[PDB]
Amino acid sequence: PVSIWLIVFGVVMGVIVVGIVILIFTGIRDR
Amino acid sequence: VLPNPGLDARIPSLAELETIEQEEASSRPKWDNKAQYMLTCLGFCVGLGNVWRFPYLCQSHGGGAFMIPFLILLVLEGIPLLYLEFAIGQRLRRGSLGVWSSIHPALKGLGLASMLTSFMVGLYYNTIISWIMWYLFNSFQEPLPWSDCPLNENQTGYVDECARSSPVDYFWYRETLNISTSISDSGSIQWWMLLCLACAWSVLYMCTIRGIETTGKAVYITSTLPYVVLTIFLIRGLTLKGATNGIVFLFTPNVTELAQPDTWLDAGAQVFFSFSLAFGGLISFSSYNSVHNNCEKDSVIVSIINGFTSVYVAIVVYSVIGFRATQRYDDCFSTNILTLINGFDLPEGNVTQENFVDMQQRCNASDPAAYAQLVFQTCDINAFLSEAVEGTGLAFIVFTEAITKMPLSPLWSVLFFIMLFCLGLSSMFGNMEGVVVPLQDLRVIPPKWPKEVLTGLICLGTFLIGFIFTLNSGQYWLSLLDSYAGSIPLLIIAFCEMFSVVYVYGVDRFNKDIEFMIGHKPNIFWQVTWRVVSPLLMLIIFLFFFVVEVSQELTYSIWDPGYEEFPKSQKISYPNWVYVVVVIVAGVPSLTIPGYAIYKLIRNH
Ligand SMILES: *[C@@H]1O[C@H](CO)[C@@H](O[C@@H]2O[C@H](CO)[C@@H](O)[C@H](O)[C@H]2NC(C)=O)[C@H](O)[C@H]1NC(C)=O
Ligand SMILES: *[C@@H]1O[C@H](CO)[C@@H](O)[C@H](O)[C@H]1NC(C)=O
Ligand SMILES: *[C@@H]1O[C@H](CO)[C@@H](O)[C@H](O)[C@H]1NC(C)=O
Ligand SMILES: *[C@@H]1O[C@H](CO)[C@@H](O)[C@H](O)[C@H]1NC(C)=O
Ligand SMILES: *[C@@H]1O[C@H](CO)[C@@H](O)[C@H](O)[C@H]1NC(C)=O
């Protein structure tokens, strides 16, 4: 009922964009 | 030896090099450890070609012996080249395009040929990682989606092409790719694949954001993990049913295959891809080291681990092929048992494998005209071990079928697809280093706009060109470019690096400068292979290319489900407009090396 390959995509695509955000953040910061 | 003037006051000088590193601590990145540099160089040599390209060529070309060929060619092309590439970046202190423009600035095409080659290899290798993480998302469920056929509309029979083919062969061509019947017929963008592509490029932009001070920890993990998993697959692979029957089949020597012009080409063109030579990334990674770093000991350690790993992955791969071929031989031979039991009324455990042939003739001597309707199979090993699958099918229709017949199916599939992911990732780091650093020495953007902004426009710009391989015919496009591209550019760029250091820079200036870094001017073995052996040995690989290109009858494989005698193979002879694509991807990286050299010599004079 959930299309199980979508929710594993979701918890992976969640980590990467918050992994990127913090990245650019600290970047410009110590920049 | 070639008379170029003004070599000094264009490169740094030898007495000035002891002061240049206490000022390039700013405005130039630097490694933290020595192991941070060796782990990002092993990840650039080992990836995705030791899995589905080398163990096929190790066997198909008289395995057990091909080892011999692959070896010699190694300590002859590979060693010398890698060494000369490591020692040229440490000295001239620039990237790839800055080194060849420092020595005779009318040359400059080796930097632009390495950038065009790194753009095209990293464009389609980020679609293979897009396919790999699609199979990783479809794990974490105990009935795997490539384990059984779906029902159609009335729930009475299977889907028609899942029954004639295999269910795994159905998950690739219809539920992953949705492939078409030709390269001419293309459709829509196929959303799921697109989402996956996005994910791949995003995961790549997070790891290579701030140049080299991110791909450090990255390399660490993305370089060890692959090794540990590969190991875990050895003590599981050598235990199942039919390993040591697929290891022996890999190492059977056939000495007739040594006397072939096609053997030594792909054994030669694998060495330039077992390493990462003529790509322009190993010069930019070596240019961050200290000036007195030993680059002679690094090129031997890197090449020993690369020659040991390629044998080590072939042991792991052919243990799984040996398990799948023993299983298919037993689920074939048990159906030849089941036919006569259903026709001659014999007990259950009656007529096993030890007594097949004698119980064939006991029945036909008992009563004739009842054996004539019996359909038996002629299945035998060395016919189940001998399929010629290569390039993507060794992971998506061969390796993942043997995983479903193991004990814990959704755990050996998560461990298998995170490993491939890691390999892909390290190779990606390499190619990205290859396209960003020559795009800074060209100065396409102002000296504002920091390192986050240039990498973000490469990861977004190569994403939109990657829409070609998400179409319905997107797998015929990816099988086209690969080979060609790689091969040609690699060989050509690799020859002019060995030429323009020995005969344009000067191998006598080179020796002195090397000695200044390490001491002990290199041996007679280094002087022989640099001067005479490896430039000569790289010409007969270039001569064998135009021998095997003019007679192989260039074709490609399609799927075509609505076709008479369907699940065998197909070759249908590429259209005439595809030579435009072959000339573009293989010719213009090869022709910018003379093309800029003709332009610069007629702009001055
Ligand atoms: C060892 O390698 C040779 C080299 O190709 C294989 O040889 C050929 O066999 C085919 C039969 O299908 C002939 O059409 C070719 O002309 C043969 N080539 C030569 C050069 O004679 C041979 O099959 C390999 N050995 C085994 C056991 O497979
Ligand atoms: C199969 O399904 C179709 C509708 O998709 C239906 O018309 C047909 O009667 C079904 N066949 C059987 C044998 O039930
Ligand atoms: C691709 O899949 C869609 C449904 O997802 C289907 O309508 C279409 O026919 C498929 N393409 C081909 C070439 O069969
Ligand atoms: C198969 O049947 C024959 C016929 O009686 C019998 O002698 C033999 O023991 C049987 N084999 C097994 C494994 O039971
Ligand atoms: C029974 O069939 C086999 C298969 O063709 C044949 O070789 C054999 O000779 C037959 N037996 C007799 C008695 O003809």
Side-chain angles (χ1 to χ4, degrees), chain A, chain B residues 1-273 275 277-412 414-605:
Chain A
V2 307
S3 188
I4 185 154
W5 79 267
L6 268 299
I7 64 168
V8 169
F9 169 77
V11 309
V12 160
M13 221 280 301
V15 166
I16 302 313
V17 290
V18 312
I20 296 198
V21 271
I22 76 132
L23 236 279
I24 23 110
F25 258 21
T26 328
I28 297 275
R29 281 266 163 178
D30 303 358
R31 161 247 259 316
Chain B
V1 187
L2 284 190
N4 71 95
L7 185 53
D8 311 286
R10 202 165 65 230
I11 60 176
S13 78
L14 277 196
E16 194 268 332
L17 270 192
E18 273 86 0
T19 78
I20 214 169
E21 61 181 358
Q22 301 91 328
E23 65 94 17
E24 75 183 20
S26 67
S27 78
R28 255 182 82 84
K30 198 179 57 61
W31 299 110
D32 293 332
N33 318 318
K34 187 68 181 311
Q36 196 162 126
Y37 164 73
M38 310 288 299
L39 282 174
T40 189
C41 284
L42 281 170
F44 195 28
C45 308
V46 175
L48 284 191
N50 310 136
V51 193
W52 53 58
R53 208 176 309 168
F54 183 77
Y56 175 60
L57 295 176
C58 191
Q59 195 265 313
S60 99
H61 286 340
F66 167 108
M67 246 328 265
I68 285 196
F70 173 78
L71 214 101
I72 294 320
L73 260 218
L74 185 112
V75 314
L76 278 215
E77 256 178 318
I79 296 306
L81 232 309
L82 190 70
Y83 180 14
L84 169 149
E85 235 188 14
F86 273 1
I88 205 53
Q90 201 176 113
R91 163 72 172 91
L92 293 179
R93 288 283 149 174
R94 294 286 298 277
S96 179
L97 192 135
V99 159
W100 311 117
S101 176
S102 290
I103 49 172
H104 208 164
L107 188 52
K108 209 186 161 65
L110 290 171
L112 279 179
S114 297
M115 187 186 72
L116 262 298
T117 306
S118 296
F119 171 74
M120 279 163 179
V121 174
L123 166 68
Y124 83 93
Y125 270 171
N126 225 324
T127 316
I128 293 179
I129 308 169
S130 176
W131 289 334
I132 281 172
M133 79 170 51
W134 163 258
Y135 274 75
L136 184 54
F137 294 158
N138 285 266
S139 297
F140 314 103
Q141 36 182 340
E142 168 63 57
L144 296 172
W146 52 86
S147 195
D148 51 357
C149 280
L151 312 179
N152 39 5
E153 271 108 309
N154 46 44
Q155 279 79 16
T156 48
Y158 292 147
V159 182
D160 176 63
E161 50 168 326
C162 197
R164 294 194 276 169
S165 65
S166 185
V168 79
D169 249 300
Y170 172 92
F171 192 68
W172 176 239
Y173 293 104
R174 203 55 53 188
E175 288 212 341
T176 300
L177 292 178
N178 204 23
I179 206 168
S180 283
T181 59
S182 295
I183 201 167
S184 297
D185 182 16
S186 63
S188 281
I189 312 296
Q190 310 307 128
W191 70 276
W192 59 100
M193 273 317 92
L194 182 87
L195 287 192
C196 271
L197 186 62
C199 185
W201 277 108
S202 293
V203 170
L204 177 61
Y205 172 63
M206 186 193 177
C207 285
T208 80
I209 170 165
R210 302 200 208 103
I212 217 68
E213 62 255 19
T214 57
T215 97
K217 359 302 188 160
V219 295
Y220 278 153
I221 199 67
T222 314
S223 252
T224 317
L225 200 152
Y227 268 97
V228 176
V229 172
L230 242 181
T231 287
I232 297 180
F233 256 89
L234 182 59
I235 81 172
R236 171 75 270 178
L238 289 182
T239 330
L240 300 157
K241 191 56 198 70
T244 324
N245 209 1
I247 298 297
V248 163
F249 172 71
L250 179 77
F251 291 152
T252 42
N254 189 32
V255 298
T256 297
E257 206 85 29
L258 278 187
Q260 284 269 103
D262 198 21
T263 295
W264 301 80
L265 180 128
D266 292 308
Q270 192 62 32
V271 172
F272 290 92
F273 209 80
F275 299 94
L277 305 165
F279 263 111
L282 293 173
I283 303 181
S284 314
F285 288 151
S286 197
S287 78
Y288 301 143
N289 282 146
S290 192
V291 196
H292 294 100
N293 199 77
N294 201 345
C295 49
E296 187 169 359
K297 207 187 284 185
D298 293 359
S299 81
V300 184
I301 289 174
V302 159
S303 176
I304 278 171
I305 301 172
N306 289 319
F308 170 75
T309 308
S310 290
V311 175
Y312 180 53
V313 190
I315 298 287
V316 176
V317 161
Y318 261 80
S319 281
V320 173
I321 291 185
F323 158 71
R324 204 193 69 145
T326 306
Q327 191 80 16
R328 277 176 52 184
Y329 173 69
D330 279 350
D331 300 281
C332 168
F333 199 78
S334 69
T335 74
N336 289 166
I337 287 181
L338 204 74
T339 44
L340 63 101
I341 303 300
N342 295 206
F344 282 88
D345 280 86
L346 288 72
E348 206 114 274
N350 219 221
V351 177
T352 63
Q353 224 158 108
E354 193 272 331
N355 46 9
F356 187 73
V357 179
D358 56 87
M359 296 296 172
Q360 293 297 106
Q361 206 35 64
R362 188 178 293 178
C363 283
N364 212 11
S366 179
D367 48 351
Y371 197 85
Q373 72 271 15
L374 293 202
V375 174
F376 287 103
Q377 291 313 111
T378 78
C379 73
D380 172 40
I381 45 177
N382 300 121
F384 289 138
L385 298 150
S386 295
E387 278 96 1
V389 73
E390 183 196 0
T392 38
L394 206 44
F396 295 132
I397 63 177
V398 163
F399 216 100
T400 194
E401 180 172 49
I403 287 178
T404 60
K405 302 184 288 283
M406 282 202 260
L408 263 295
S409 295
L411 185 132
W412 298 114
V414 180
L415 261 62
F416 178 65
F417 284 120
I418 72 160
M419 168 216 308
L420 294 169
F421 183 76
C422 276
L423 264 30
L425 222 39
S426 15
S427 283
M428 272 331 285
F429 290 165
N431 294 325
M432 200 71 138
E433 183 57 355
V435 186
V436 173
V437 182
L439 217 49
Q440 295 174 330
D441 304 353
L442 259 59
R443 275 169 299 273
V444 299
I445 58 170
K448 286 194 174 178
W449 291 15
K451 193 58 178 289
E452 290 89 4
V453 195
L454 181 58
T455 316
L457 268 67
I458 294 308
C459 278
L460 191 136
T462 327
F463 173 77
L464 301 181
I465 312 176
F467 279 20
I468 305 298
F469 318 112
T470 65
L471 303 186
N472 277 331
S473 60
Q475 209 263 328
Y476 306 134
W477 281 106
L478 195 140
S479 294
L480 169 65
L481 80 65
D482 184 350
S483 42
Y484 275 151
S487 233
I488 279 314
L490 281 274
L491 277 169
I492 296 193
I493 296 164
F495 175 77
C496 295
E497 292 181 343
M498 197 75 77
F499 164 74
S500 69
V501 168
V502 180
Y503 292 104
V504 182
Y505 184 51
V507 82
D508 304 297
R509 158 174 289 91
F510 194 57
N511 278 339
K512 250 132 258 147
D513 104 326
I514 285 191
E515 178 238 306
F516 164 65
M517 297 175 141
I518 323 171
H520 64 70
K521 272 191 181 177
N523 321 336
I524 303 99
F525 172 73
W526 301 110
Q527 296 298 134
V528 160
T529 56
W530 278 343
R531 285 213 186 101
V532 58
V533 166
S534 177
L536 170 66
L537 207 67
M538 280 189 294
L539 288 174
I540 80 164
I541 309 299
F542 188 65
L543 186 62
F544 281 169
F545 181 78
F546 295 101
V547 172
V548 303
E549 192 257 322
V550 299
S551 68
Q552 276 184 355
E553 290 92 7
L554 173 72
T555 45
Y556 71 113
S557 286
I558 73 179
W559 187 231
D560 211 356
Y563 155 70
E564 290 60 51
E565 59 272 10
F566 154 72
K568 43 169 282 188
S569 295
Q570 187 68 260
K571 298 290 176 61
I572 57 161
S573 87
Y574 270 118
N576 57 354
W577 55 263
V578 85
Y579 294 148
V580 171
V581 172
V582 166
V583 167
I584 279 174
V585 304
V588 312
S590 296
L591 287 184
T592 49
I593 309 176
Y596 195 88
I598 302 303
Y599 151 76
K600 209 67 169 63
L601 266 65
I602 72 168
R603 188 164 150 102
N604 293 319
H605 198 202

